[PDB]
Design a protein around this nucleic acid. Structure first.
Ligand SMILES: [Cl-]
Ligand SMILES: [Cl-]
Ligand SMILES: [Cl-]
Ligand SMILES: [Cl-]
Lengths: 212, 217
RNA sequence: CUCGUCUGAAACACGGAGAG
């Protein structure tokens, strides 16, 4: 079958930048190439068909071009809502095949997270496990360090993190860190603290509570 | 309004079989090519199969040839994907897409359904526990922890969908136990915390679990 | 009839177009 090699695998660009995504077919596919935009967790949407034709309703900042077996998707002036993964696809031959995708991140000004901490609920404590949650809200860039301390003892091996996809309007991320302890361990200690390090913070921010 | 609605997804044992349905409305599949495309979690789009109008010719990706069968029922205006000898490698969101009209969009796929997750695993279904993340000491954050469920997915809404601004529902993480856990949070005015109630609505279809959890200070 | 093409709601088969 026909391979569609897409490059780069990811890029980060500022609002107003010209973004170019390339997809090379392993053999001629004439002009039978489409480009799609997929927001995370959403159905893809058609942008470009037949290599260079703009699908109706799509903003004019999107264009496609063909040179031999090289196909390019260009965003002439990137906008925040253009955060997405972009895919080329050939429909010249069965089996149809997709490129591996290019993830486009919007590069904005640094923005420190607002940090919140949540103790485990009394309902959870009725069972044998205690989850403590630290929320980092609306920050940029995505890299952030969360460290958990229990009675000023650094924790290891007992937390997990999840991050939202980039917001399509303000280009920020949010992040949840969950520290999981046995109820016994939670009951045997007093001070619970999440220490956050981020480019937007001039010193690490600590949010903490005392059990009780 | 053109619509494509996939159904039939869920948990299936390795070696098992499962049939997906793609119900179309707003148009007739008798006049369009219909395609199945899948996306493993965190990975790219992968073409699976298609069926052509007027002829009913069918085409398959090499990774599924001999195991999957695409078909269509024009009276029901529905396309099908029969999947046999499933393996872990077939775990994916399965989308049905309409190839559009040649004069208007060439061979581009111009409408896609929302997709339905197929999970190929030997693990047992397990419903979640839902715990409040209570607000406490201008803006206040609260949320709900959706813990210890399998398989994906869960849907979380707030106040039965009346509340969407400020909501962040995080991707699930796989715990060391083999069970998923996720949180959903929302920032709200602190002046309203004493009078505005907040309820997180969780639905885990694989286990027939619906939970509403009140989140109070 | 043919097509490494176009079109009919149509990648193949079919109708039509175009060229041979
Ligand atoms: Cl425009
Ligand atoms: Cl070339
Ligand atoms: Cl105590
Ligand atoms: Cl259960």
């Amino acid at each position: 079958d026909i391979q569609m090699t897409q490059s780069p695998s990811s890029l980060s660009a500022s609002v107003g930048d010209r973004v170019t995504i390339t997809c090379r077919a392993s053999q001629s596919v004439s002009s039978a190439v489409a480009w799609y935009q997929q927001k995370p967790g959403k159905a893809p949407k058609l942008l470009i068909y037949s290599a260079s034709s703009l699908y109706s309703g799509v903003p004019s900042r999107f264009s496609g071009s063909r040179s031999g077996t090289d196909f390019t998707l260009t965003i002439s002036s990137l906008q925040p809502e253009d955060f997405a993964t972009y895919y080329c696809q050939q429909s010249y031959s069965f089996p149809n095949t997709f490129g591996q995708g290019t993830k486009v991140e919007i590069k904005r000004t640094v923005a420190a997270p607002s940090v919140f901490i949540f103790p485990p609920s009394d309902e959870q404590l009725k069972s044998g496990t205690a989850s403590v949650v630290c929320l980092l809200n609306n920050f940029y860039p995505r890299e952030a360090k969360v460290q958990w301390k229990v009675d000023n003892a650094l924790q290891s091996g007992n937390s997990q993190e999840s991050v939202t996809e980039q917001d399509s309007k303000d280009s920020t991320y949010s992040l949840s860190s969950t520290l999981t302890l046995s109820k016994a361990d939670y009951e045997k200690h007093k001070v619970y603290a999440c220490e956050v390090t981020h480019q937007g913070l001039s010193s690490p921010v600590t949010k903490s509570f005392n059990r009780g | 309004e053109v619509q494509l609605v996939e159904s039939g997804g869920g948990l299936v044992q390795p070696g098992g079989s499962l049939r997906l349905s793609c119900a179309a409305s707003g148009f007739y599949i008798s006049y369009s090519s219909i395609h199945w495309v899948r996306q493993a979690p965190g990975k790219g789009l992968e073409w699976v199969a298609s069926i052509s109008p007027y002829s009913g010719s069918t085409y398959y990706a090499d990774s599924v040839k001999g195991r999957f069968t695409i078909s269509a029922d024009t009276s029901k205006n529905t396309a099908y994907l029969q999947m046999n000898s499933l393996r872990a490698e077939d775990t994916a969101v399965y989308y049905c897409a309409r190839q559009g009209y040649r004069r208007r969009s060439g061979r581009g796929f111009d409408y896609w359904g929302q997709g339905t997750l197929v999970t190929v695993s030997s693990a047992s279904t397990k419903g979640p526990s839902v715990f409040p993340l209570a607000p406490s000491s201008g803006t206040a954050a609260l949320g709900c922890l959706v813990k210890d469920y399998f398989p994906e997915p869960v849907t979380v809404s707030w106040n039965s969908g009346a509340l969407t601004s400020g909501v962040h529902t995080f991707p699930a993480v796989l715990q060391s136990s083999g069970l998923y856990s996720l949180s959903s949070v929302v920032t709200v005015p602190s002046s309203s915390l004493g009078t505005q109630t907040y309820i997180c609505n969780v639905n885990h279809k694989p286990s027939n679990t619906k939970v509403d959890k009140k989140v109070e200070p």
